[PDB]
């Protein structure tokens, strides 16, 4: 129930700002004074501390915390030492930001509980939307199956959900339609799809792109 965010980056600072908005107990830690001062208002607490020094980490009473997040992603030395301290101090959940494949490897071996590549992950997702101008957003259920949010082209304007079937033709299923902000969850055929309306499809990754090609 208690959270500690060490490293008030753009990533770290967003976690401490969000968790606090959700109304949790969050300790904001950073070696830079100016960063601490800034997040003072957006955290249950703010403290200037060098997370690589043990006595400084004990002074925070770090052992109190259920979840500690190390969002230091530029300094590998700072990150690895901190996480090692946290593991040595028996913190239950240690979530760390990694810089690259190698930093991930060091963290893995010193027992970080969950490792995140916020930039690389958001990279591939944005790249997908660049390459395929139709995909607005998506979530992968596995390597093969995925739920995709698609911007409807004029190729679908005033088309019927029963008429242009996805279930029989492509083996995919339409989950939602968003026309002018209004949302039709679990839509019943037939329904009108206008141009620029958010279409949420679900199925095999290859199957969807086949629908994208031939349907749109």
């Amino acid at each position: 129930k208690q959270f500690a965010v060490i490293g008030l980056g753009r990533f770290g600072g967003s976690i401490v700002k969000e968790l606090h908005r959700m109304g949790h107990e969050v300790l904001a830690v950073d070696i830079n004074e100016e960063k601490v001062n800034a997040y003072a208002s957006y955290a249950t607490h703010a403290v200037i501390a060098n997370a690589t020094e043990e006595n400084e980490l004990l002074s925070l009473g770090i052992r109190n915390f259920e979840y500690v997040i190390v969002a230091i992603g530029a300094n590998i030395q700072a990150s690895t030492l901190t996480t090692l301290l946290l593991k040595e101090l028996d913190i239950p959940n240690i979530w760390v930001k990694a810089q690259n494949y190698y930093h991930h490897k060091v963290l893995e071996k010193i027992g970080a509980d969950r490792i995140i590549h916020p930039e690389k992950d958001m990279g591939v997702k944005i790249a997908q939307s660049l390459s395929d101008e139709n995909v607005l957003n998506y979530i992968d259920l596995s390597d093969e199956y995925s739920i995709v949010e698609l911007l409807a082209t004029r190729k679908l304007d005033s088309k019927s959900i029963i008429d242009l079937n996805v279930r029989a033709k492509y083996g995919c299923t339409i989950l939602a339609i968003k026309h002018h902000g209004d949302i039709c969850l679990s839509p019943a055929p037939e329904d009108i799809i206008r141009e620029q309306d958010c279409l949420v499809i679900m199925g095999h990754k290859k199957d969807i792109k086949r629908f994208e090609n031939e349907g749109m």
Partner: protein
Amino acid sequence: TPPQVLAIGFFLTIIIGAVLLMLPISTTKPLSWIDALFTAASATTVTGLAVVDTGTQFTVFGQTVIMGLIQIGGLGFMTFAVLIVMILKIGLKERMLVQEALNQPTIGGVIGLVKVLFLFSISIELIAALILSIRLVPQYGWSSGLFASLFHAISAFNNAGFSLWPDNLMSYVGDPTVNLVITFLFITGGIGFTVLFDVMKNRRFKTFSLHTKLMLTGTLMLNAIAMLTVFILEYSNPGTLGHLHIVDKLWASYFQAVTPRTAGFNSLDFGSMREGTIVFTLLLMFIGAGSASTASGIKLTTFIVILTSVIAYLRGKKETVIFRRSIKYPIIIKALAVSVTSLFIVFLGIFALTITEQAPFLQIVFETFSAFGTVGLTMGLTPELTTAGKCIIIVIMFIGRIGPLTFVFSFAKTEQSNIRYPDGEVFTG
């Protein structure tokens, strides 16, 4: 343990002292539990207050125990500890305690200060006391003369306050020998051993340390204020100083300006003073004399620093500076800690005693201040104190002498949090 060792060792020589004084050989008329501890404490904490008269109640033996404890407390528990070992070396662990005991920031040749201070003490104690106080005090014979002339020196130099006979020296209001020889002793004992060693070594008006410079000019001008104050206020008042020759009006006005920090000798009775003078004497004995030293509650320099600091702030120069050598921050905040602690304690003593006793207010107030300031002066509650009131004056005498800080540091949990925290806006105006 440097703070604790100072405290436990000091407390022990009071217990040692009390048991020695409660012992038959030292008492003429059987002595109380509380009073043996009180009188012992007051000699060893160089205070000057006594529930029981010294000249009457204590045998020649007990009066020597009194001198010993006065000698012990006046120079410092550790100073002798070092001398014992020296004569019997010398560890850093020891040099650490000595530095703490002589309130020094550096451990730099601090044993050289112990060497000087002791040798200089017994030197001026002997030559001035035995010799000069025997040329005009063999009118008590030899067995009385040579012992009362010596006792009064060890009491004088160490800022004790303990006079052997019932008049705490009122008898000699005019006598120049007793006036001079006793002021010479209790003012130079007062100002820093720093100041003595520095004046002895450097020898020039110019080449004196900031401390020494501040002490020499500070003690001079405050004395000159207080004398003018005591004179102007107690001039008319017939009770004291009203019926004295224009010359003896000085020897009294001088003495009462000079004795409150922190000697404790009476040239005039303090009970019969215009309340204004007493008020002034309160302040004058909150501020001790010097930080070396013989005794104080919050020492003269501390007062300058804090005052000059506020003065500076009000101008306001960004940094507090005296004599065109600026005063670092860690001094200000220590000064602010010495200051607050001492005053808060004195306030609790006053609050306690107006619950612990039925008596006049001003008399309790003067009593607390003089107890903490290890002064020794009373408008006279001292004999009239409740058994409980004696206890809490004993405490206040213990803390006041040892230093209000090093007392706290004995039971203080030393916590060094390395982490900092964001700024916090807080109005103080």
